[PDB]
């Protein structure tokens, strides 16, 4: 099957890229190794930057996001037993913190793609990349895991297949440089059936560790506890999880944490990762296939959306005028934004998490930063602007 751009992965990066290309008359074929049900059924976060909201609306796929999304005026930084509100709406001159679950974004983009004649193969298996260093790259795969071996002949391959996809290894080790940080802690995330304890997100730093109170709906809440990076979910009974959440979220004015059944519990590791370059011949990486951020800053899906806007612009210049300049500089342009988001995500992570390797001096300056950011208008404005994207 011949196309212009072969896309590996139907996450936010692959789906947004395929639709941006469609809006400019450029054809694509997406392959996805999981089922449509699986990709549409995640409990992944939905904190969207203003740029991602603008992009969804610009693309004509933002109607359900605007109708069903939750628009908050701010969020809270809790530390030393006190909550401190960051009024994003006041500090940014009218913007909101937007939440619209990643699975909802995926559902909207899959539906828009299928409705506009888009080609998406779900449940593919045995995926491989070939001749990426030529003008005729190829993608090979088997439909429905064990179908006959099929080939996509294309001009470009977009590697939108996440951290463990096959596209990043297709950039030879001798050409790439990787940057990484392993945080000395992980998150224990829980999906709970209970009303929300507060109207806005709560990012809490406590002597015992970090806690994050988020939401999905009026009935379903999403909460996280910082845990030691080696910890297993079998070390954390429901009783221990709720006791630790109550301890870390405690306030002098008496906060009431609403508890319920934990439908899901799991440990997720926290990492920073940057691959440079994000291209090799006709292969171009975007999103988690090229870089990872710790989720404290909620930048991952937003960076995937920024990467594909640059890639689509380069592809458009190639098909319209035969120009290669923007494609040649795709890595250069994307990395400028990536490094700033990596810095912010690292800043939020280190400011809010307990580090047991920290000296008492380091813990003192961590608490001093928390005091400063919540008592300075410029520091709070900078946090607000970084949080909703810039």
Contact code string over 196-235 relative to ligand FAD, x by CB under 6 A: ----------------------------------------
- 276 known ligand binder: no
- 215 known ligand binder: yes
Under rule CB under 8 A, residue 176 binds a second copy: no
Measured CA to CA, the distance from residue 150 to residue 168 in angstroms comes to: 21
Nearest-10 Cα torsion for 369, 371, 377, 379? 10
- 42 known ligand binder: yes
Rounded to 5°, the CA angle 17-274-316 comes to 25
Contact code string over 144-173 relative to ligand FAD, x by CB under 6 A: ----------------xxx--xx-------
Pull the structure tokens for residue 245: 């959440």
Contact code string over 219-258 relative to a second copy, x by CB under 8 A: ----------------------------------------
Binding at 162: pick from ligand FAD, a second copy, none (beta carbon under 5-8 Å per type):
ligand FAD
H/E element, 385: helix 377-388
Q: Give Cα 235 to chain centroid, integer Å.
A: 28
Sheet bearing 70-72, strands edge to edge: 47-48, 97-99, 70-72
The DSSP secondary structure of 323-350, one letter per residue, reads --HHHHTHHHHHHHHHHHHHHHHHHHHH
Which CB sits closer to a second copy, 263 or 372? 372
Identify the residue among 69, 209, 295, 314 touching ligand FAD (CB under 6 A): 295
Question: Min. distance of Cβ 343 from ligand FAD in angstroms?
Answer: 16
Under rule CB under 6 A, residue 124 binds ligand FAD: yes
The residues with which 119 forms a beta bridge, in sequence order, are 29
Measured CA to CA, the distance from residue 350 to residue 345 in angstroms comes to: 9
Task: Please list the active-site residues.
Answer: 72, 203, 295, 299, 387
Binding residues (CB under 8 A) for a second copy: these are 177, 179-181, 272, 274, 336, 339-340, 342-343, 346, 359-362, 364-365, 367-369, 371-372, 376, 378-379, 381-382, 385, 390
């Amino acid at each position: 099957m011949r196309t212009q751009v072969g896309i590996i992965g139907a996450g936010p990066a692959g789906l947004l890229l395929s639709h941006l290309l469609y809006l400019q008359g450029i054809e694509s074929i997406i392959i996805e190794n999981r089922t449509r049900e699986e990709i549409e059924g995640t409990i992944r976060a939905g904190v969207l930057e203003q740029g991602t909201v603008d992009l969804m609306n610009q693309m004509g796929v933002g109607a359900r996001m605007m109708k069903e999304g939750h628009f908050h005026e701010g969020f809270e930084l809790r530390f030393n037993g006190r909550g401190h509100r960051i009024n994003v709406h006041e500090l940014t001159g009218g913007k909101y913190v937007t939440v619209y679950a990643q699975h909802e974004v995926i559902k909207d983009l899959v539906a828009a793609r299928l409705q506009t004649g888009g080609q998406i193969h779900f449940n593919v298996g045995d995926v491989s990349l070939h001749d990426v260093d030529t003008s005729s790259p190829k993608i090979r795969f088997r439909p429905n895991k064990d179908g006959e071996l099929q080939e996509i002949e294309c001009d470009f391959i977009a590697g939108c297949d996440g951290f463990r996809g096959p596209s990043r290894p297709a950039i030879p080790q001798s050409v790439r440089k990787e940057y990484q940080k392993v945080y000395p802690f992980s998150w224990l995330g829980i999906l709970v059936e209970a009303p929300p304890s507060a109207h806005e997100l709560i990012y809490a730093n406590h002597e015992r560790g970090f806690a994050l109170v988020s939401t999905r709906s009026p009935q379903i809440q999403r909460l996280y506890l910082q845990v030691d990076a080696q910890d297993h979910i079998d070390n954390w009974s429901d009783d221990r999880i709720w006791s630790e959440l109550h301890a870390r979220l405690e306030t002098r004015d008496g906060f009431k944490l609403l508890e319920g059944p934990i439908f899901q519990k799991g440990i997720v590791s926290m990492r920073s990762f940057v691959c440079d370059p994000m291209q090799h011949g006709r292969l171009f990486l975007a999103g988690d296939a090229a870089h990872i951020v710790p989720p404290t800053g909620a930048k991952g899906l937003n960076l995937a959306a920024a990467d594909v806007q640059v890639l689509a612009r380069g592809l458009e210049a190639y098909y319209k005028a035969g120009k290669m300049e923007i494609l040649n500089r795709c890595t250069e342009i994307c990395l400028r934004r990536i490094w700033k988001a990596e810095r912010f995500s690292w800043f939020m992570t280190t400011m809010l998490h307990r580090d047991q390797g920290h000296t008492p001096f380091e813990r003192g300056i961590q608490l001093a930063e928390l005091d400063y950011v919540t008592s300075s208008r410029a520091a709070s404005t900078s946090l607000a602007e970084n949080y909703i994207g810039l």
